[model samples]
Target chain A: HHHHHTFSKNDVEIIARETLYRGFFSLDLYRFRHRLFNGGMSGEITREIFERGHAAVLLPFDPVRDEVVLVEQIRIAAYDTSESPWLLEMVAGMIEAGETVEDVARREALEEAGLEVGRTKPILSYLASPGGTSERLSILVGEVDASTAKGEDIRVHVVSREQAYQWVEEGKIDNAASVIALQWLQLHYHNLRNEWT
Target chain B: QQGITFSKNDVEIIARETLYRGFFSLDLYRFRHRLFNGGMSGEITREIFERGHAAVLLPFDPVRDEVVLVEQIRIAAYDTSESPWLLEMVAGMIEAGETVEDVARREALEEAGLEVGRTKPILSYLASPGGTSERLSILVGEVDASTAKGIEDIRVHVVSREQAYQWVEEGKIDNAASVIALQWLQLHYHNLRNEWT
Candidate 1:
């Protein structure tokens, strides 16, 4: 039997939400109480969550060429923790106001990689890490020419699917979007290829 | 967003200042890097969120072919996720100096109330790198789901791999950690089963 939780958004009571900071990103402090899983309502709990709006990533796949497009750029957040600040990642950018995931995916592909690709397929959409932020991502694997160019901040790599997935296993392509996409591609590539054919 | 085959040295930091300090901190960064076109880039500013890192563990009982998961309310998931109470893999913040594997087993014990056995890494990924420094390492640890147990505002759900994978395919399980963990299990279950059984 599949088990389900009794609580939903209705079970939570928001006492207050204050914007702590607003810059290129914003932070919100939350005060709330929820119906505890074991029983009655719990005491008020406070949490400060990072609030950067949602984004989308497109993993450009060229089925015909058996290659995928990747982009590299500076990610200052990664500067301290990773092997390097310059990360090889997917074509991604924050979704602007009133933009759908579809719009952002297609737009980011153009803006980040300078690639003209049509139609995006939803691979997986998730809250990047729900404990701290409201940021969710719509990750897709879409067909491309695999041949690409990009901005001054970016370098495009069109590598064979074999090489791309190999790098994923080697922990070289380590960002969430790219890793998830490559793994999804590894599992579902054949099915998509058959359908596309 | 300007770069080339460069390291941190190529980027000149103009300023690194704290924007907000609370349970979570934010910093503003101004920098310029060597452009791909062989020129220095103009200054660009970005705000980075500092939430540290996390370790995620998906407990698999090879004997029963099922998994133990946690259901809890996540404040940040309130709006972005389908439910504030999300069904997710057992995960916890990686305290400074803690080995990544240590955190996963501790979280497994604390959140799922189940002891994990011989573990293996699935993959590691930045939860979201563009704005946050948070990276997550996910591992699958063999377990005994029969112990059934996160009485943290948490309820534990034990589901068969088929049912879990079905939910993943249908988007019923949508948080990044769980989705990735479940999908990885789906792709490698046969190999894992052969190894563990």
Candidate 2:
């Protein structure tokens, strides 16, 4: 959080940027030079950045019921050796350029789990993988009433807080944002429940 | 976890062309797979960003009741309002044919200048399963915090376990791996410390 002159955006000089692929996902190669922490700027370094844009993850927690809502869907990339490529995860979606993080959160919850979120708290935002992709995710803990929740091609599961944390322990939840959200609940459950209620 | 017989064999990659190759590679994949309802999913086209896999380790010295963290500027976070520099656990990509434990040890040395002691595998998860194929393994390991020396933009900080969790609460530690690792430590700190001495 120090704004000292250790290193900043000014240190990076992008000489060229070439779009390699432009499909559902895009990649760009940049020829750039960056000021080294030791002293001066280095020679041209070619780094390919995966431009996937930003995303929002929402954890729908029912404080009164002491339960959380998760979604199950097939993920193609997890088709390697996974017994089941379908993963249990929090509701998430890509952040459109003109939209706010909360917009994406509520929209994803409706689209993925058909839940209407009420009070929500910003949990944390983090880079999915800073070494390659510019994919950052904002995690929000939201209050939802899943009494009439329904969605397409996705199954919604409501589990107690203890059971949810047990799923995390048993490695049943295998995604970054979901695990972070579940662990966040584990650490701040009482405080968050009191705040939201 | 039912009604899905999805596997790698279910996917037929008709065509795969490399779009960009540098520090990372982007590939256009034309493929098809069997749907869950016992039918073909039709031919599909998708782009996958391959950034390889990485290992993250939280080095903790139970004897001194401290943990070592590294601070560095991430280029991918340039556009985000947050500070590009992040306080994170030691993490590095697994090079070709390298084991996960090796990367954990190497990153611990290079990033924090500390030797890793007994390590416990925390968990592994797909970083972003939608667009990128980047999987990460998190480990909580024992380290001697006294021998900390900084490297490059990675400055080492030794702090109490409580302070580390406080940073997580304060949003100072905003990386997924670090947040998960520190939370794991908080949940199992007393038990892990008991194992040391």
Candidate 3:
């Protein structure tokens, strides 16, 4: 059984000109400009806004052990709200010129978690938010030895297969990568393991 | 710093005012003196615009050649429904003096314990055009999935390439960033890898 979901943009119209990016996100003060959108109406569209940003992320895994790796970090946004700041997230890094996502991933793994990774599989990629900022992400997955992944600088933890499922139900895991990864593994573990070898 | 004057006016009757702002929307109360020379007689209303940053995440799977993702509680949307957290790719804000690629690489390491392998051009867009000024960038990249560790409280799992693609087809990877980036990568992964290494 096969079905296709399709939509056409024939009725689409550009009502206003939106602004592009004024600067990057790190800047304390950045300005953005965008035009309005009205249905079947006329409006002016500006060409300058802060809606252009690009980035990447890496997903590491161990097929044999059936385990995935993640990190915990203090989030300032959470702290500002007087909430829990330490967020459990996937290991991710930004891409760089003259460097592939693979290059950045390897470099960051060494610097942040001190995990040396090899090989790579492309999983998914997409725009992070498309309304105001032009930020996008590309996610991937690979194999790793969850146990005994100690490094010189960054501290690392290895979760077993059983613990992985438990944490998912316990509400300890918060990141998107974690949730989807676990579900995907659970649904397709046998098939995936069989295909790996 | 020669002389600082302090004057106190004794008044028996006084009146105060309170302003109402809608819930689920950002509100700011502030004041500024337009004319200090006029003894603070003139005042102006000031509103603070809220802004934020994020890094999309991708977990690298070295063995099965795929990535992992997670879903979590979204406190902001909790009031809208019983569900607060949601399914999302890994994400984080952009810091000072860092590129989107850099942030991507860092997040890959932090969240997924993977390394960046290769990347594509940055895709820019708005997250919620209706209200918030949140923006996002989607970048596609390859990752080293061999090294990974579950740090602190981060929860994640490894999914094969086939599964990630399947989710995309099923519309389960509903988030904008995940959808855009993953789809883009699917179209360009083979050619991009050939150009990279």
Candidate 4:
């Protein structure tokens, strides 16, 4: 299933085009110089923007177990909140030409987690951010064993719920996917897990 | 690292009237020796979709028996999906006006529906590092989960530490941050829960 929302002015010069996404998503990149509209829904629109690079992300899930597999990598963004930038995140990869979201999820799972995903479950799909640059996130619920994960320099310990709750108390696992997926799961665990089992 | 041994390209956006635009580019060079045999393809063609910048998504916090999350409807996820509609934690774009902490606190109110009293820095990193050049900052804070649900649209709910753990064992929660956070918390359960603060 696909969703559509057009972004334009009264003139409607630019029409929303369909992304040639495959596995999970597909997008194009272009550099430009223009901007200074308002700061999120308010202010006089200005112009002076430019593009620097192109990118895309894919979130993998394990539907059978009602579990989501993600990668834990070191990132600089964490500096914004804490001194530790290494994070626990969704299993995602960039969209390469002729590759689908499924392809990326499967390949990324191997590269990042060393897990072989079987099938996937779509939870909610959307963009990662929309205020500054052009980027899309194809988030999904892929399946994997709740045992352990091993890869190049990465390891998985089948994180448990007590562990998650404990982390919140100790100040660990503070990324988005970690929180939201848990909340959603907690609220709908009965049916979701039932289906998974 | 040569920044990434593979190189060679000049892309230009010929025109941009509105939503869609035209572009032209040239692959300055290619590694012909390994071309079809096994190398980078220089002569390439690609298209793109216009979108917004990426944002960070922190995991849920269950400190003192409560879940912490920053919520917001991310355009990148919403735009590509069927309706761009997602009920997530308090999340906002990392803006130039404020630091990542500013965005985290702001989103805490918008999505989770709470005011972060005292924050416990946890972890951070990029959500989709491959394609999008964006990053995320994760944090675990203490909040009053009892009154959180009353916030409407944005609400934080705290649960029993043990119950939270059970959910993971049952495959209830699935996001990566939640999993890791739970694990981290479990690792230090004794000190975390028994602490006076």
* Backbone clash numbers for all candidates listed: 2, 0, 112, 65
Error of 3 at A112 (Å): 2.0
Tell me, by TM-score, which candidate is best.
Answer: 1
What is candidate 4's CAPRI-style docking category based on DockQ?
Answer: incorrect
lDDT of 3: 0.46
> What TM-score does each model's chain B reach against the true chain B?
0.92, 0.91, 0.61, 0.53
- Single out the weakest 10-residue window by summed lDDT for candidate 3 chain A: A1-10
lDDT of 1: 0.83
TM-score of candidate 2 relative to the true fold: 0.90
Instruction: Write one digit per residue (lDDT tens) for candidate 4, span A132-153.
Output: 3334444455567744466512
- The C-alpha stretches of model 3 lying farther than 4 A from their native spots are A1-42, A45-52, A80-83, A151-154, B1-197
Clashing pairs in 2: none
Task: For model 3, give the RMSD to the true fold.
Answer: 20.1
* Chain A TM per candidate, in order of listing: 0.93, 0.93, 0.68, 0.62
For candidate 3, what is the total of clashing residue pairs?
A: 112
Q: Tell me the TM-score of model 3.
A: 0.44
Tell how far residue B36 is off in model 3, in angstroms: 49
lDDT (10s digit) by residue, model 3, range A8-111: 12222324442221222311112212211222322332212222334456656677887666665433222222123344555667665566767776666666
The segments of candidate 2 whose C-alpha lies over 4 angstroms from its true place after superposition are A1-6, B1-15, B33-39
lDDT of 2 at B134: 72
What is the C-alpha lDDT profile of model 2 across A1-197, one tens digit per residue? 11111466777876888887777777777777777666888788765778888988999999887788888766766655355566788898888879998999999888888788899998898777776777889999999875656672466777887788888888877688988999889988998878877
Candidate 3: tens digits of C-alpha lDDT, residues B1-197: 11111111211112222222221113232332212123442232222123555656554433446566644322222212223223455667777787778887787677666666765553443343222334455565566444444341244445565676677766455466665455545544566656655
Task: Output the lDDT of residue B56, model 4.
Answer: 36
What does the lDDT read for residue A152 in candidate 1?
43
